Structure 1
Amino acid sequence: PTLWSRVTKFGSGWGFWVSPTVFITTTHVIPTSAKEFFGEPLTSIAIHRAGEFTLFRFSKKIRPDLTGMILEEGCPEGTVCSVLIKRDSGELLPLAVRMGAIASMRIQGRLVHGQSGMLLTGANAKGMDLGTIPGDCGAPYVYKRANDWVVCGVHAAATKSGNTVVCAVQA
């Protein structure tokens, strides 16, 4: 009965269960030495990568407690999403982000491609929480539309200021 339930610690960051068999994450957090994930051998896992966005489809239900949600290739410009950040502290941190255009976007010295957005906290977090930290990568971008939650990508990067974030998206 909760979206928070779907946000799972993974590699150097997090990922998100879209359904009992589909898990999405940020490509840079995935382990580079692995034979199995969540007790299924890589043998049995379809991997689909598109830049900083990776989708895994398992051959058996890993989370049969979940129903399948809508996944979309980003959202309409001006949509206000929630980035669902979990911290190792036990803290849950849903932050509002106004989404902008698809772009390639030089984020502290790095070329990153995805949908840009700006945190509504503007306070421009520098250790009060209120913004993202490197450890948060792979957290999902969701919003409510009619009666349904939509997930439209995963957290790939953020600028020192904290104002600008990049959501990696399905191709």
Structure 2
Amino acid sequence: SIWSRVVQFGTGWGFWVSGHVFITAKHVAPPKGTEIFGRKPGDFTVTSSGDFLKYYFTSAVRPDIPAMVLENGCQEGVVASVLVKRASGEMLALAVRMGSQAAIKIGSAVVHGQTGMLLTGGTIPGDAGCPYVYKKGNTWVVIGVHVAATGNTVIAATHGEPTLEA
């Protein structure tokens, strides 16, 4: 069901956080100016940080879904899931122990994101944009989008202002 929020997008995948909010890896997204989901620029606004790309649509695109919480990464040691879809429609929930912050070259330049360790009981380059999620008690929470793999290590791009200020 949460899997219906994961859809193909550009050269990778993206994730519906809510009916109005779509997130993806910037490096797989269609060019700025492209019509998406039958919507023209103007009907949506685009924000980016590093390899994190976020679309906000004025009118809901997926009215069938509730808003999920979007956090800026998670605590170290948290075991999250990478919701990997393949073009065949296959669904692979990859367990990942979230780690600390690293950088990596992605195309033109260097982005920064939260590393993670793929747990065995991996990813391929067309998996970029798939969501990292975890259950916080009763609530599913999205913490970022898949950017790249390494040798066991994955990187997630993150985004979001924490509710509480210092």
Alignment TM-score, normalising by the size of structure 2: 0.90
Instruction: For 2:157 and 2:96, locate their aligned partners in 1 and report how far apart those are by CA, in whole Å.
Output: 14
Preserved contact between residue 112 and residue 157 of structure 1 (Cα < 8 Å): no
Per the TM alignment, residue 121 of structure 1 is displaced from its structure 2 partner at its CA by: 2.0
Per the TM alignment, residue 113 of structure 1 is displaced from its structure 2 partner at its CA by: 1.1
Aligned residues: 158
CA RMSD of aligned residues (A): 1.6
Q: Could you tell me which residue of structure 2 aligns to residue 165 of structure 1?
A: 154
The runs of 5 or more residues in structure 1 that have no matched partner are 123-130
Is 1:152 paired with 2:151?
no
Instruction: For 1:33 and 1:63, locate their aligned partners in 2 and report how far apart those are by CA, in whole Å.
Output: 21
- Matched residue SS, 1:156: strand
Instruction: For 1:12 and 1:145, locate their aligned partners in 2 and report how far apart those are by CA, in whole Å.
Output: 30
Per the TM alignment, residue 103 of structure 1 is displaced from its structure 2 partner at its CA by: 1.9
Fraction of identical pairs, as percent? 57
Instruction: For 1:33 and 1:46, locate their aligned partners in 2 and report how far apart those are by CA, in whole Å.
Output: 11
Instruction: For 2:77 and 2:17, locate their aligned partners in 1 and report how far apart those are by CA, in whole Å.
Output: 23
Per the TM alignment, residue 38 of structure 1 is displaced from its structure 2 partner at its CA by: 0.2
Instruction: For 1:56 and 1:33, locate their aligned partners in 2 and report how far apart those are by CA, in whole Å.
Output: 11
Per the TM alignment, residue 111 of structure 1 is displaced from its structure 2 partner at its CA by: 3.6
In structure 2, give the amino acid aligned to 1:151: V
Q: Residues 56 and 33 of structure 1: is their aligned pair in 2 closer, same or farther, counting only changes over 3 Å? A: closer
Instruction: For 1:33 and 1:53, locate their aligned partners in 2 and report how far apart those are by CA, in whole Å.
Output: 14
Q: Could you tell me which residue of structure 2 aligns to residue 32 of structure 1?
A: 31
Instruction: For 2:70 and 2:156, locate their aligned partners in 1 and report how far apart those are by CA, in whole Å.
Output: 13
Alignment TM-score, normalising by the size of structure 1: 0.87
Is 1:93 paired with 2:82?
no
- Matched residue SS, 1:68: coil
